[PDB]
């Protein structure tokens, strides 16, 4: 039952950039038990906490950092 958290998204970035859709789509209600919409309602808040750099991954808008 993974939960969408600030610290959880940081690991996603340092590992590989992501888009809001791609960041939330991965979580999904599969385990977090969070609706496809709610998962976003709780992901949007954490996204900004990342404070990464905007870039296009494979022609896709991806915001993230790279250690």
């Amino acid at each position: 039952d993974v939960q969408v958290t600030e610290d959880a998204v940081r690991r996603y970035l340092t590992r590989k950039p992501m888009t809001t859709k791609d960041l939330l789509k991965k979580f999904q209600t599969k385990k977090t038990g969070l609706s496809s919409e709610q998962t976003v309602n709780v992901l949007a808040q954490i996204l900004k906490r990342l404070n990464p750099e905007r870039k296009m991954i494979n022609d896709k808008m991806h915001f993230s950092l790279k250690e």
Partner: peptide, 19 residues
């Protein structure tokens, strides 16, 4: 029904780093 799942998906996309 009107699957408005992506509707907000783009809205929150801006609040992040796409204002």
């Amino acid at each position: 029904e009107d699957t408005d799942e992506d509707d907000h998906l783009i809205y929150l996309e801006e609040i992040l780093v796409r204002v």
